[PDB]
Design a protein around this ligand. Structure first.
Ligand SMILES: OC[C@H]1O[C@H](O[C@H]2O[C@H](CO)[C@@H](O)[C@H](O)[C@H]2O)[C@H](O)[C@@H](O)[C@@H]1O
Length: 394
């Protein structure tokens, strides 16, 4: 309910949202992504699509389907786009286009505005009617595999507009409008809502973690781009200087390979808790983020990382990988610290665990920074502004 957000962002931002919604209230809007049960894109749309409807926008949300072979091709496309590395069999491109065709037939695409989320459904623009097509990129495309990019740019160049999470992901090899809209957290979502101390305490104890002693938390998949092995290395280095400290890695199911290496890297320290929760364990993530003393998101590559703003909103200082969208959330020395190695991560863990007053000041700065920049009302407003801008130029 948009009324409830005045508490956080004030009345001017809400009036502005109603004003923009009035101008759009008889456009048909379709969002297309690749999972409804999944990660950050799903978490955003589950909150954002309902807010659009409540403003009287005709907004729908459809999910492409595929074989695991399709999702093997798109995972590798994802890693090649972010790392600039890999060998891509020519068969991958043929698998991709086939599942574009299959999905086009199963999805009505005749809307005034079509948002395509990330590379997986990007090839649906082949089957575009009229209307305004916007490619919403959530990942780091600053320095990609030239063959995968060259290919996807074949499709991207046919869109009317493009949204990236930070300006640094804008391509000078594209002439269509490129708009930087950071993602956001919904402060009223189960992930972010206040919890009674009782519920936090229950969930922490349930996983055998001691809330009498400091908790270092990373929330992330057991995936190379989140560097769980590096995170354990950071903790191992800090542990010598903060012996009572605990690490919680809060994961969600080649992924088993990384998890195994993570178990091996942890082989020795018994204050390491490598958890695996079902993906929709929102209240458990909430509870762990609230129980944390310091949060890490030590990513190698990261489009944005909602886990950062989630932690900052709960007044937790974040130690973040010095990459992509983490940099606009983690203001070095103010809301957290940016690090390029496990060694610097360890250095800043020890600093924060030993400097309570500085931790809490960072926590306050963190919440205020999210309040001004990364609440769902901010993303919703800029989203409505992009639609108005791009529809009026056809
Ligand atoms: O592209 C597939 C991945 O999409 C999600 O994450 C991306 O989008 C988030 C919201 O904009 C960003 O915070 C994040 O940095 C991006 O990688 C999803 O959460 C992942 O599980 C998928 O691999």
């Amino acid at each position: 309910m948009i009324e409830r957000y005045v508490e956080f962002v004030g009345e001017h931002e809400i009036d502005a949202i109603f004003k923009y919604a009035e101008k759009l209230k008889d456009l048909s809007i379709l969002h297309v992504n690749s999972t409804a049960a999944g990660g950050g894109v799903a978490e955003i749309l589950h909150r954002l699509v309902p807010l659009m409807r409540e403003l009287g926008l005709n907004a729908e949300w459809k999910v492409i389907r595929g074989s695991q072979d399709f999702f093997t091709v798109t995972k590798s496309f994802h890693n090649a786009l972010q790392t600039g590395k890999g060998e891509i069999p020519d068969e991958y491109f043929k698998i991709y286009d086939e599942w574009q065709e299959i999905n086009a037939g199963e999805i009505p695409l005749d809307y005034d505005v079509v948002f395509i989320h990330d590379p997986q459904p990007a090839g649906l623009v082949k089957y575009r009617k009229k209307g305004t097509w916007i490619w919403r990129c959530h990942i780091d495309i600053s320095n990609p595999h030239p063959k995968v990019w060259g290919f996807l740019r074949g499709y991207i160049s046919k869109y009317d507009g493009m949204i990236v999470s930070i300006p640094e992901f804008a391509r000078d090899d594209l002439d269509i409008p490129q708009i930087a809209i950071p993602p956001s957290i919904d402060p009223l979502s189960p992930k972010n809502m206040p919890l009674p101390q009782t519920t936090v305490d229950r969930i922490v104890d349930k996983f055998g973690v001691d809330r009498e002693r400091p908790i270092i938390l990373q929330v992330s998949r057991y995936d190379r781009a989140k560097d769980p092995v590096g995170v354990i290395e950071s903790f191992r280095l800090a542990k010598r200087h903060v012996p009572d400290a605990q690490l919680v890695y809060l994961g969600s199911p080649e992924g088993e390979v990384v998890y195994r290496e993570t178990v091996e890297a942890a082989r020795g320290e018994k204050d390491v808790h490598l958890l695996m929760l079902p993906p929709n364990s929102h209240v458990e993530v909430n509870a762990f983020q609230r129980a944390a003393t310091v949060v890490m998101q030590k990513s190698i590559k990261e489009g944005f990382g909602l886990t950062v703003s989630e932690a900052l909103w709960k007044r937790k200082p974040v130690i973040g990988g010095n990459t992509g969208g983490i940099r606009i959330q983690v203001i070095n020395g103010v809301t957290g610290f940016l690090v390029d190695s496990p060694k610097a991560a360890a250095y800043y863990l020890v600093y924060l665990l030993k400097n309570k007053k500085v931790r809490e000041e960072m926590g306050e700065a963190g919440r205020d920074h999210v309040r001004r920049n990364f609440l769902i009302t901010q993303q919703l407003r800029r989203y409505l502004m992009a639609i108005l801008y791009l529809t009026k130029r056809h």
